[PDB]
C-alpha cells in the first residue's frame, strides 16, 4: 500500500509500506531519504498526531493518504 509523506517544503516523498507497518517504522523509512532523526519528527494525519506504538491498520490510514511532517525542534 503506497502512501505519501509531505514535509514543510512540500518535498512529497513516497513510501512502499504495508498496513501492518508501525509509525516508528515510517518515522525511520524517511530516515533513508533525509537526515532528520526519528525523535525530531511528528507525523500528522489530518489534525491528530500519531502514537509511536500503533500500526497503520489501527489508524485506518490507507493508500494515497497524504499525511504531514513537522520538525520537532530539539
Amino acid at each position: 500500500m503506497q502512501i505519501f509523506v509531505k514535509t514543510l517544503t512540500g518535498k512529497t516523498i513516497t513510501l512502499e509500506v504495508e498496513p501492518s507497518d508501525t509509525i516508528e517504522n515510517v518515522k525511520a523509512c524517511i530516515q533513508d531519504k533525509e537526515g532528520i532523526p526519528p525523535d525530531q519528527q511528528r507525523l500528522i494525519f489530518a489534525g491528530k498526531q500519531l502514537e509511536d506504538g500503533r500500526t497503520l491498520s489501527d489508524y485506518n490510514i490507507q493508500k494515497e493518504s497524504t499525511l504531514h511532517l513537522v520538525l520537532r525542534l530539539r
Binding site: 504495508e18 508501525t22 523509512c29 500500526t55 513537522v70 520537532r72
Partner: protein, 1124 residues
C-alpha cells in the same frame, strides 16, 4: 482563532477547535511565537467541561495535548487543567477523551508530578486502568511512577488506596508498564526509608511475593537496568525495617538468590556452581541484599577498627536467629555457596568488599555446629591466606577478623587448616613486619600489627608429613644431583593423590626447582637436558625413557598426571596472584640446496621457551612470577613435545583450553571493559605482556577482545567494545567512497586495495548504481572476492577442482578450487617463467592486503585455508615437519610416512650392511621400485636440486630426498609467494600483533564457526508485537522452522529479514533495534496462505501472515527470501 472557541453555537466551537488544533499542530515554537496560551487554556477547559457533546470534548483535550509540543514554555499554564483532566478520569464519559487525557498528563508528569499528586491524581489515573488501551496504560503507569517520586511522607494516603492495584501490575506482561510499576515502588521505598510505619505498609505480603516471582521469570521481563533497581529496593527496605528483612527470609528469599546466581535450581548441590553472567553492577546489588539479611556487626571488640575503614537497636534479625533457628539454617546452608563463588570469581574493587563483609556476618552469627556444616566443602582456609597477604587495607583487616572468629568458634579444625595453608605464617609475617587519609592508614597498620601479635600469642605460639615430603623431593630435583627416575615418581604421587597446600608448594622451593630442572643449559649438571625432559615426560605423560624408544610410534595413553600438575600449579598461580586491575570505579651465496641438496635443519621451537630467566618482554614484578614461567615451560612441553622424539604424534599433551586461568581470565575480562582505560590507552602492562608470551592462560574470546584494543588507534578499539557489551550507551571515523562492478570484480578489487590500505579509515563498498547500500554490499564484497580467489585459472591453490552450483549468478563457475583439508599455495621450481611468477606474487600481495583489511574493519572472509598456511603467517615456517605435510597434501604424506619407516629402519641396521639396504622393500617395493627422482611428486616440472630429475633417488640419498620433499613442498617451493604475503599484510598492520593467537585458532579469527539457532535463544531475543504473543500460532510456527535450517538458509533468512547474511557480534541480542515480528494485515476476501511476508530491513520487521499450517510458512519463506 480564539473567539471561535468562545462561540455560543456548539457546532461553531466544534468547528473552531479543529482550526485551533492545526494552528498548534503543524506549527512549532518558532512559528507560533506570540500564541496567547493565557486565554486558550481557560477556553479549552471550558470546551472540555461541555460534557454533553463528546466531539467538543475530544478535540479540546487533543488541543491542550499539542500545545506543549508547540510551546514548552506553555506547560506552566497547562497545569491548571489537571483537575479537569482528572475530572474526565474520575467519571469517564468519552473513553477517547479518557485515553487522550492520560497522554496529556504523561507529558505533565515529567515536570509537574507533584501537582498531580497534590490534586489526588494518583488514585484517579489508576482507577479505570483496566479499561484503557496499551498506549494509555503506559501513560498512566508512567504518571504513577512519576507521582511516586516526590512525596513528603505525610502524603501516604494518596498512594495507600492505589497499592493493591500496583501490586497486581507486577503480574502484567507489558514490558514498558512493568518497568513503570517497579519504578513507582522503588521511588516509594527511597522516600519511606526513614519511617518503618509506612514501609511496612508499602511492602505487602504480595509485593514481596510478586517482585520475588518477577525475577525468576525467564526470559527477563525486567531489563538489566531495572533488575538493579528492583534488587536495590530490597536493600533500602532491609536496612531500615528488619521485620521485612525477617519477612523476606520467611518468604523463601533463598531460592530466589540461588536461582539468580547459581543458574538453574537443579535440586542437587552444585559443586561447580555455574554463574549466570551478570554485570559488575548487578552483583554489587545481589549481595547488598545478602549483606542486609544477616544481622549487623558490632562496633566494639575486634570490629572496632571498622569505624576507621569507612573514613575514606534490638534487632529482630538477631531475634530471628533465636526465634527461628531453622530459618537461619535454611538461609545459610544454601546461600553461603553463592557468596563463596561470587567473591572468588569477579574482580571488582567494591564487590569484593561487600562479598567479603557478608561472610563476616554469616560466620559471626552462626554458631559452632553450623560453620562446621557449612564450611565443610569450602576451602576458606587457603582463601584467607590470599586475603591476608594483600596490598589492600580492608582485605587484610577482614582476613584478620575472619581469622579471629574462626579460631574462636572452631579451634579443633582451623588450627590444622591455618598452618597447612599459610594462615599462621602470613599473620606471623604481619606481626613482625615494621615498614585524614594520610592519618588513617598507619593506624590500621598500627591496628594490624597489634592484632596479629595478639593472634599468634593466643593461638600459634605453641609450636607436617607432606611438607616433609615436598621440602625433601624438591632437593632431589637440584641441578647437581642425580635424582634418578624416582625423584619425580614421588611428585607424581604427591601432586596427584595426596592433598598438598598452595603454601607447601609455594615454600618448599618446588617452583624454582622445576623451572631449573627443565631449563638448565650447563654441562655442570649431573643429568643432561635430553635425559631430564624424557624422564619428565615418562612421569607426567608415560612417554618412553631415553633408550626405550620402541619400533612403533610414541603412543600417548593419558595425560592425567600432567593434567593434575598444571591445575595444582594453576591453583598456586591463583592464590599467589597480585596483578592490579585499574578500574575507574563508579559506585654467490652458495645455494647448497640447489647445487647439493642441503636443507636448512628443522628448527625446534621448544628451544626458545626452555629458558630459566623471563623473556625480555616480561617487565612486571609479581609474587607469582616464577609460577607463570613454570607454566610457559609446561605449556611448551605440553604442545611441542613431539620434536624431542622422532615418531611422536602431532597430538599435544593437554588441550590449550585447559591452561586457561579462571581468575586471570576474570581479572582480564573486567579489565577490558572500562572505557576510561581504552580511550586513554593506558592498559595495564601486566596484561599485554602476559598475552603475547603466555596466550594459553586466556580463552579465545578474551585474546580476540584483547587483540582488537591493543593493536589499533583510539577509535577502532572502542567500536569493538560497543559491539560486544552494548549497555554503555562510536567516534569520528571516515568512509571514503568507492564503486564496484559485479562482473569486473577481481580487477577492481585489486584497484581499490591498491590505494586504500594507507589510511586508517573504513572501506566503502557500493555497487555500480544499485539500491542496496550500507553494510549489505561490503559484507557481500568479501564473500564475493573470497568466492573469486578460489578460481582454478589463477593457479594459486592446491587441491582438487570442482564445479559447484554457483548461486551468485556466475554460471560459468570457472571450476572452483575445493580441498578437503584446506587451501595451501602452489610450489614453484626454478623452472618457472618470470612472468608466470610475478603474476602470482601480485595475488598473494593482494590476498595479504585483503586479510589485513579484513581485520581492521572487523569483517569476515570465508577462505577455508589449510592449517599450515597460518603457521607461515605467524612466522613458524622453519619448524614444519612431516606432520604438516599431512594437513596440505594428503596423498604424498602417506608415501612420506611409509618412506621414513625405511629411513628409520635404515639407521636401525646401520648401527649394527650394503646388502641390507637393497632388502628394504615397502610392500615388496624397494626405493627404485617407486622410481622416484628429485622432483616433487605431483609437480614434475619442479626439480629439487640442480638436475635432480636426472638423479634417481636411491637408498643412499633417501634421507636427503625426504628432507628435500618436505623442504620444497612446505618451505621452499612456496617461499616466493609468502615473502609478498607477509609483505602485503605488513604494509598496514604488522604480523607481530597476530602472535596472541595460535595456528589452529586463526581460522576463527576471520571465519567464525555460525551462531545460536535453537528456539530458546530466539524466544529471548525476538520481540513479537502488534498482534502476536510468545504463544501465538505463527510465532510458535516460526521459531520451530528457524531451528531446522542449514548454514545457508540462515544466511538467506538474515539477508531478507535483517539485510546482511550473517548475525552481528554476539547472537541475536545485538540487533539494533531487535527482531520485531508483527502479524501482516489483509482484508476479508484474502486467504493468507497465498502471500509472502514482506519486511522492512531498516528497523528489522517481519510482517508475517498467519499461515494455516507449519509447512506453508516453511515454503513461503524460502520464496520470499531468494527473491531479492
Amino acid at each position: 482563532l480564539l473567539q471561535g472557541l468562545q462561540a455560543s453555537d456548539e457546532s461553531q466551537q466544534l468547528q473552531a477547535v479543529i482550526e485551533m488544533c492545526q494552528l498548534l499542530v503543524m506549527g512549532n515554537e518558532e512559528t507560533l511565537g506570540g500564541f496567547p496560551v493565557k486565554s486558550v487554556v481557560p477556553a479549552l477547559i471550558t470546551l472540555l467541561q461541555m460534557e454533553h457533546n463528546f466531539d467538543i470534548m475530544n478535540h479540546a483535550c487533543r488541543a491542550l495535548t499539542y500545545m506543549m509540543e508547540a510551546l514548552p514554555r506553555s506547560s506552566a499554564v497547562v497545569v491548571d487543567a489537571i483537575p479537569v483532566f482528572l475530572e474526565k478520569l474520575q467519571v469517564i464519559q468519552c473513553i477517547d477523551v479518557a485515553e487522550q487525557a492520560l497522554t496529556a498528563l504523561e507529558m505533565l508528569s515529567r515536570r509537574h508530578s507533584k501537582a498531580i499528586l497534590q490534586a489526588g491524581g494518583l488514585a484517579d489515573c489508576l482507577l479505570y486502568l483496566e479499561f484503557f488501551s496499551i498506549n494509555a496504560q503506559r501513560n498512566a503507569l508512567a504518571i504513577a511512577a512519576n507521582c511516586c517520586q516526590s512525596i513528603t511522607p505525610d502524603e501516604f494516603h494518596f498512594v495507600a488506596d492505589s497499592l493493591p492495584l500496583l501490586t497486581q501490575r507486577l503480574t502484567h506482561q507489558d514490558k514498558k508498564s512493568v518497568e513503570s510499576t517497579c519504578l513507582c515502588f522503588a521511588r516509594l521505598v527511597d522516600n519511606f526509608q526513614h519511617e518503618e510505619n509506612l514501609l511496612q505498609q508499602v511492602a505487602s505480603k504480595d509485593l514481596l511475593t510478586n517482585v520475588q516471582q518477577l525475577l525468576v521469570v525467564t526470559p527477563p521481563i525486567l531489563s538489566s537496568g531495572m533488575f538493579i533497581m528492583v534488587v536495590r529496593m530490597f536493600s533500602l527496605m532491609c536496612s531500615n525495617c528488619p521485620t521485612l528483612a525477617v519477612q523476606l527470609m520467611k518468604q523463601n528469599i533463598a531460592e530466589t538468590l540461588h536461582f539468580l546466581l547459581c543458574g538453574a535450581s537443579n535440586g542437587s548441590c552444585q559443586e561447580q556452581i555455574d554463574l549466570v553472567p551478570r554485570s559488575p553492577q548487578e552483583l554489587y546489588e545481589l549481595t547488598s541484599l545478602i549483606c542486609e539479611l544477616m544481622p549487623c556487626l558490632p562496633k566494639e571488640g575486634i570490629f572496632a577498627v571498622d569505624t576507621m575503614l569507612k573514613k575514606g537497636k534490638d534487632d529482630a534479625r538477631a531475634q530471628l536467629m533465636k526465634e527461628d533457628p531453622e530459618l537461619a539454617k535454611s538461609f545459610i546452608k544454601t546461600l553461603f555457596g553463592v557468596l563463596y563463588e561470587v567473591y572468588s570469581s569477579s574482580a571488582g574493587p567494591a564487590v569484593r568488599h561487600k562479598c567479603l563483609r557478608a561472610i563476616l556476618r554469616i560466620i559471626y552469627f552462626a554458631d559452632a555446629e553450623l560453620l562446621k556444616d557449612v564450611l565443610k566443602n569450602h576451602a576458606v582456609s587457603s582463601h584467607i591466606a590470599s586475603m591476608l597477604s594483600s596490598q589492600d587495607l580492608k582485605i587484610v583487616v577482614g582476613a584478620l577478623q575472619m581469622a579471629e572468629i574462626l579460631m574462636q568458634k572452631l579451634p579443633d579444625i582451623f588450627s590444622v587448616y591455618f598452618r597447612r595453608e599459610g594462615v599462621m605464617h602470613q599473620v606471623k609475617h604481619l606481626a613482625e613486619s615494621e615498614s585524614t587519609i594520610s592519618n588513617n592508614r598507619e593506624k590500621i597498620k598500627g591496628w594490624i600489627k597489634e592484632q596479629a601479635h595478639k593472634f599468634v600469642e593466643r593461638y600459634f605460639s605453641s609450636e607436617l608429613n607432606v611438607l616433609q615430603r615436598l621440602c625433601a623431593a624438591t632437593e632431589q630435583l637440584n641441578l647437581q644431583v642425580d635424582g634418578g627416575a624416582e625423584c619425580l615418581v614421588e611428585i607424581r604421587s604427591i601432586v596427584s593423590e595426596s592433598d598438598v597446600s598452595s603454601f607447601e608448594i609455594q615454600h618448599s622451593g618446588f617452583v624454582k626447582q622445576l623451572l631449573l630442572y627443565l631449563t638448565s643449559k650447563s654441562e655442570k649438571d649431573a643429568v643432561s637436558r635430553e635425559i631430564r625432559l624424557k624422564r619428565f615426560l615418562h612421569v607426567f605423560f608415560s612417554s618412553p625413557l631415553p633408550g626405550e624408544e620402541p619400533i612403533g610410534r610414541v603412543e600417548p595413553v593419558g595425560n592425567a598426571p600432567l593434567l593434575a600438575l598444571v591445575h595444582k600449579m594453576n591453583n598456586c598461580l591463583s592464590q599467589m596472584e597480585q596483578f592490579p586491575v585499574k578500574v575507574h570505579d563508579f559506585p654467490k651465496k652458495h645455494d647448497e640446496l640447489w647445487h647439493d641438496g642441503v636443507c636448512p635443519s628443522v628448527s625446534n621451537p621448544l628451544e626458545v621457551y626452555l629458558i630459566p630467566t623471563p623473556p625480555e618482554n616480561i617487565t612486571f614484578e609479581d609474587p607469582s612470577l616464577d609460577v607463570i614461567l613454570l607454566l610457559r615451560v609446561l605449556h611448551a612441553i605440553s604442545r611441542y613435545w613431539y620434536y624431542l622424539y622422532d615418531n611422536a604424534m602431532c597430538k599435544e599433551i593437554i588441550p590449550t583450553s585447559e591452561f586457561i586461568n579462571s581468575k586471570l581470565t576474570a581479572k582480564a575480562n573486567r579489565q577490558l571493559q572500562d572505557p576510561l582505560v581504552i580511550m586513554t590507552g593506558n592498559i595495564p602492562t601486566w596484561l599485554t605482556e602476559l598475552g603475547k608470551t603466555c596466550p594459553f592462560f586466556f580463552p579465545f574470546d578474551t585474546r580476540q577482545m584483547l587483540f582488537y584494543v591493543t593493536a589499533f588507534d583510539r577509535d577502532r578499539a572502542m567500536q569493538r567494545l560497543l559491539d560486544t557489551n552494548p549497555e554503555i550507551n562510536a567516534p569520528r571515523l571516515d568512509r571514503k567512497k568507492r564503486t564496484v562492478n559485479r562482473e569486473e570484480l577481481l580487477k577492481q578489487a585489486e584497484s581499490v586495495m591498491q590505494d586504500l590500505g594507507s589510511s586508517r579509515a573504513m572501506l566503502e563498498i557500493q555497487y555500480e548504481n544499485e539500491v542496496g547500500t550500507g553494510l549489505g554490499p561490503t559484507l557481500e564484497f568479501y564473500a564475493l572476492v573470497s568466492q573469486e580467489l578460489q578460481r582454478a585459472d589463477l593457479g594459486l591453490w592446491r587441491g582438487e577442482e570442482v564445479t559447484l552450483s554457483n548461486p551468485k549468478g556466475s554460471q560459468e563457475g570457472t571450476k572452483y578450487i575445493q580441498n578437503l583439508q584446506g587451501l595451501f599455495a602452489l610450489p614453484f621450481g626454478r623452472t618457472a617463467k618470470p612472468a608466470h611468477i610475478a603474476k602470482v606474487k601480485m595475488k598473494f600481495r593482494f590476498l595479504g592486503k585483503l586479510m589485513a583489511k579484513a581485520i581492521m574493519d572487523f569483517r569476515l572472509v570465508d577462505l577455508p585455508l589449510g592449517l599450515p598456511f597460518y603457521k607461515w603467517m605467524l612466522r613458524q615456517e622453519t619448524s614444519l615437519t612431516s606432520h604438516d605435510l599431512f594437513d596440505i597434501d594428503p596423498v604424498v604424506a602417506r608415501s612420506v610416512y611409509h618412506l621414513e619407516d625405511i629411513v628409520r629402519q635404515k639407521k636401525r641396521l646401520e648401527q649394527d650392511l650394503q646388502y641390507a639396504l637393497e632388502t628394504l622393500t615397502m610392500n615388496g617395493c624397494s626405493v627404485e621400485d617407486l622410481g622416484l627422482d628429485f622432483t616433487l611428486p605431483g609437480f614434475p616440472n619442479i626439480e629439487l636440486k640442480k638436475g635432480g630429475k636426472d638423479i634417481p633417488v636411491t637408498i643412499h640419498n633417501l634421507e636427503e630426498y625426504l628432507r628435500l620433499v618436505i623442504f620444497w613442498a612446505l618451505n621452499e617451493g612456496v617461499s616466493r609467494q609468502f615473502d609478498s604475503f607477509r609483505d602485503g599484510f605488513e604494509s598496514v598492520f604488522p604480523l607481530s600483533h597476530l602472535q596472541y593467537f595460535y595456528p589452529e585458532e586463526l581460522d576463527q579469527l576471520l571465519c567464525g564457526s555460525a551462531d545460536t539457532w535453537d528456539a530458546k535463544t530466539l524466544m529471548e531475543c525476538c520481540r513479537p508485537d502488534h498482534g502476536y504473543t510468545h504463544d501465538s500460532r505463527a510465532v510458535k510456527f516460526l521459531f520451530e522452522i528457524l531451528s531446522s535450517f542449514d548454514n545457508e538458509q540462515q544466511r538467506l533468512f538474515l539477508q531478507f529479514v535483517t539485510g546482511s547474511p550473517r548475525l552481528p557480534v554476539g547472537g541475536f541480542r545485538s540487533l539494533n533495534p531487535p527482531l520485531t515480528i508483527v502479524r501482516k494485515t489483509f482484508e476479508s476476501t484474502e486467504n493468507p496462505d497465498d502471500f509472502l511476508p514482506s519486511v522492512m530491513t531498516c528497523v528489522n520487521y517481519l510482517k508475517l501472515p498467519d499461515y494455516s499450517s507449519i509447512e506453508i510458512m516453511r515454503e513461503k519463506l524460502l520464496i520470499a527470501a531468494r527473491e531479492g
